[PDB]
């Protein structure tokens, strides 16, 4: 085998699986999914004695891109960290956040903007590193914001209001209110509202993918599957996650 050496020994035969997924979303103002897809990979970090024959079991939510395919992949892993597979999904995707924008014009001077985010996942799970990005027009002379959760700055250079939230549990609701003070502008120029975009990180796979087992068989050496210490983690992050306002 060109990817694994012969005499590997570990007192502690341990493995770690990472399900890493990017969820992409384009949503209309009223809540229609215009486009949604997940890109994921599974990274394995393995410390297993000898030359173990491994079998990776999941739950078929997935369109997969040296192993042997059978819901079930069989393989002898290289020692250390490696990428076990890449995959893509478009069906039955968990959208972790709903963004509900609201924009009222007030003469030619104010823009009243309210944005509500709802977390759609188990309340025992926490999203982290949440950022909500609200674009502002170029003739913006000032911004007032109120938000009961997190912090928000108008970043004039970036022409955006950036709302940051460290933690948010599932099945919760939060909102920000902004008043966008506008300069006079060429009348025929009308504002084409860019989307409100999110970033976040969730401890589950938006695809729905579940690891069911990783079975280790090593026929020469005197450890077996129930000897192997096995860990899994899921890191779902936003890709393009845009809601049209």
């Amino acid at each position: 085998i060109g990817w694994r050496r012969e005499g590997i020994k570990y007192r502690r035969n341990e493995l770690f699986l990472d399900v890493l997924e990017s969820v992409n979303l384009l949503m209309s103002p009223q809540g229609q999914v215009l486009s949604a897809h997940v890109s994921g990979r599974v990274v394995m970090k393995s410390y297993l004695s000898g030359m173990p024959e491994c079998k990776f079991g999941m739950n078929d939510k997935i369109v997969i891109e040296x192993x042997x395919x059978x819901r079930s992949i069989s393989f002898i892993p290289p020692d250390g960290e490696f990428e076990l597979m890449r995959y893509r999904t478009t069906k039955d995707i968990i959208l972790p956040f709903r963004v509900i924008p609201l924009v009222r014009e007030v003469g030619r001077t104010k823009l009243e903007v309210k944005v509500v985010i709802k977390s759609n996942f188990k309340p025992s799970l926490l999203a982290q590193k949440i950022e909500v990005r609200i674009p502002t027009p170029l003739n913006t002379s000032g911004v007032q914001v109120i938000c009961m959760k997190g912090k928000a700055k108008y970043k004039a250079s970036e022409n955006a209001i950036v709302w940051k939230i460290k933690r948010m549990a599932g099945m919760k609701e939060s909102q920000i209110s902004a008043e966008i003070e506008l300069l006079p502008t060429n009348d025929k120029k009308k504002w084409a509202r860019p989307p409100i975009s999110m970033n976040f990180e969730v401890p589950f796979a938006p695809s729905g993918l579940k690891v069911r087992y990783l079975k280790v068989f090593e026929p020469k050496l005197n450890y077996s599957d129930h000897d192997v210490i096995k860990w899994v983690r899921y890191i779902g992050r936003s890709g393009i996650y845009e809601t049209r306002c």
Partner: peptide, 6 residues
């Protein structure tokens, strides 16, 4: 984070 596999 890492959770024991069941």
């Amino acid at each position: 984070g890492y959770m024991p596999m069941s």
